[PDB]
Symmetry: D2
Subunit: 264 residues, 4 copies
């Protein structure tokens, strides 16, 4: 009767289904997979990447950057929504092979430093190569790359360092306000009376209102299905996409229903 073997982080096949660069705005592209969002922003002074997906997506992220004309030494900054392996996986490998710098808040930095281990709810089950944050950003701080400004909005809940990123792009000259907000879900979490997260409910409630007030003409999420995106249908990908109000209110209804069924 020996000890159990180690279990590997296994996800659905659609999360690992590679796709071609899909354009979001004049300077914004989707270079992740069918069910995982990885946003690339091309500026006059380099590129910016937001999230990366599963750890084995590093080679795919570099190939689509080459398709857009972004050499590895042109990737300047890496921004993160939260430091889970399904979104910050290939960050450590991308830093070695691109020379880019990582910007994140203190909570995402300490979670990225230990590779997702010692998670508040998952423990050491979902881990990935660790990476060090190069610049610590605060709530409301602005990050400027090539004339494009990225504003961070802390929305703690899914992770303590969950962050929504906003910036103003253009769509054939006409301006567009992009809001890439993090997941508002609490999958299998203990909500009431969590010793590792005593203020989890208060953080979620304050995060629901934060998403509602984000300046947003076009919302994206780390998982496209959460905001009713569909990367597979190309030009119709953002047709049925939700607003910030509809995304936050739909997640809060699921939160209260999950919080009510935990009391039972």
């Amino acid at each position: 009767a020996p000890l159990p073997q180690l279990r590997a982080y296994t996800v659905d096949a659609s999360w690992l289904q590679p796709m071609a660069p899909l354009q979001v705005a004049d300077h914004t592209w989707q270079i992740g997979t069918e069910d995982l969002t990885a946003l690339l922003v091309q500026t006059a002074e380099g590129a910016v990447l937001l999230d990366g997906g599963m750890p084995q997506m590093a080679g795919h992220l570099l190939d689509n950057m080459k398709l857009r004309g972004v050499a590895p030494q042109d990737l300047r900054l890496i921004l993160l929504s939260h430091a889970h392996a399904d979104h910050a996986g290939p960050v450590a490998e991308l830093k070695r092979r691109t020379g880019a710098h990582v910007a994140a808040n203190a909570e995402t930095a300490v979670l990225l430093a230990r590779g997702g281990s010692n998670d508040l709810h998952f423990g050491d089950g979902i881990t990935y190569p660790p990476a060090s944050a190069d610049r610590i950003i605060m709530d409301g701080e602005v990050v400027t790359v090539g004339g494009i400004a990225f504003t961070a909005h802390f929305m703690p809940g899914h992770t303590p360092g969950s962050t929504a990123w906003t910036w103003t792009d253009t769509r054939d000259g006409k301006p567009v306000r992009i809001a890439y907000a993090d997941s508002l879900s609490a999958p299998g979490y203990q909500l009431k009376g969590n010793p590792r997260y005593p203020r989890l409910i208060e953080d979620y409630k304050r995060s629901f209102a934060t998403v509602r007030a984000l300046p947003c003409d076009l919302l994206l999420t780390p998982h496209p299905g959460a905001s009713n995106w569909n990367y597979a249908v190309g030009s119709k990908a953002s047709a049925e996409a939700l607003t910030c109000n509809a995304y936050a209110d739909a997640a809060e209804k699921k939160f209260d229903a999950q919080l009510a069924r935990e009391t039972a």
Copy 2:
């Protein structure tokens, strides 16, 4: 015309004036200096230290621990109010010479990891040996050592990771509620429109209310003069000490007056 030399962190002499262990409660002692608070809590399973003072106070903190009968291997945990050199200085040396573990939040951990460098308001002017945090604590989390529970209360403002620690001790059997709250000052800070701290005012206002609601029969601060303590007069040290209400309201009046004179 050469470049300027490096300037050393020089403080008042009363900050470095060593004193004997002054008793606060049955299990709580003051082992710092006349104008710097370093609290020792002796339990049945070891000791707990809260803050340390200037970096050159390491030898003094160990001598007073020996006076109380606490061997270096008996110091179990190190708690921090905030990670400035005048309070987290000898932490790196204390870890090497005691085998203790450091518990702090994510913001204090990342500031302790770079030794106070790259400060939001002071830059690299006030630095000290860096130390790594061993356990990350959240807001409201409980730390239990030898049957004594320490509850963390985040009060961001002076530093993003400023933390107030509360625990229930006894005074000859009779219970006492101790609240060791951090400094609420903003010395020379840019309050309105700080690019390194855009939500500084909102964090201070939410911290004022946090201190007022702390369960406290006896308040202590990293600087004794902030709460009208006087470690030099021995038995009369806590005579004119302020309450949590009086400490927060007095700091908020100084904050609003300083915030008003910044508009000019």
Copy 3:
């Protein structure tokens, strides 16, 4: 045609076969598994652990410590042979649950900091929760715990920070010289012309001579079969154990034969 799933570090069942504490000397015990060595040294001032095994062995290491009468707060120091997941796995969890400090050289520390990721030969295939080294030791440095001195001997090869630990114990008063040397194997490594390790051959040759000259009356290795130990037969576990000379010369013959078959 999606991307491949993540593969889990799967080892033989005998590596995860728990066993009872087997005594080596008066103060030395084997508390690992049948095919993985985890040595515990009990002193008057606490305990010392050398290696831990697979990451899922943390609970087993704590149970055998309780069998020997070693509370979690009594584990003082953790020493490592090398920072691979099959020997430094549960180190991160053991630090959180015991308050112990980790001592290792600079090469083992940087490999332990990134959880075995970015390995010189294995890449990100074999990973484990990361841990931070608390004390950096040099070649020939002495570590003293409870009157028992541990001397480090750098033997680079298997990993750049591979370390052999030696100490003098007793066997019913009569002294015994224990040498816990690391693995000298190079499983699947590129030996000649490795860009990640240009001096790999010179490091192995200098490590062969280092093991031969270790003061040793009783040799142990991270894998018991490497030194012909057999933890399952209890009192006869060290019967057919090899000497330091026989262990180094046998590994060098396998190294030269492997180095010769790489030229082909």
Copy 4:
């Protein structure tokens, strides 16, 4: 009788005397000060900096990079001889303001991570802002930037991670072999029987022979006076410069004389 104040790292004025970019080869420039070497290598794919000097030289290093036409985002890599404050000072600030990556060995990385604190011989006396190493290099490893290859040669002694860097440049088409070797001095060190460095003598002796065998047509050192350079006289700066043989043999004579006077 209070505790002593903190003392600042104060050096000679000539170390902080700024100078204009002095050309060494077609692609190599000296952009440090009169008595501190900071080498810039301009390639087709960016620039490479070797050492930086005192921590307050960050602004000077950026101004001379602008004089050579190197924007902050064009500095690709930072290489270090050793991690003392008089040569790795502004590294932390240069990383934030340039987006460059730092490459160093494991010993220099762990010393750079704690900002020179806990030095083997100096303790916490000479400290500087800490920085994290992005890429770990081994002995003999090659670093290629813009077609120019940098080979690392470990020469432990002054620091455990002391490193000599070599590369082949041109001088009007004609090739030149540059060797930037680290200091071989042991200022005020305990050489025989150092508990923090038991193999200090063996490391120095093996480092003397390493410098002698470096492929070098033109030698530079972190301090120009060590190799008889004189940055002030412009075109005659390398006139009386020493060879690798003359530099190593002169330092070994001073080492043996210092080692002999320690026995007394």
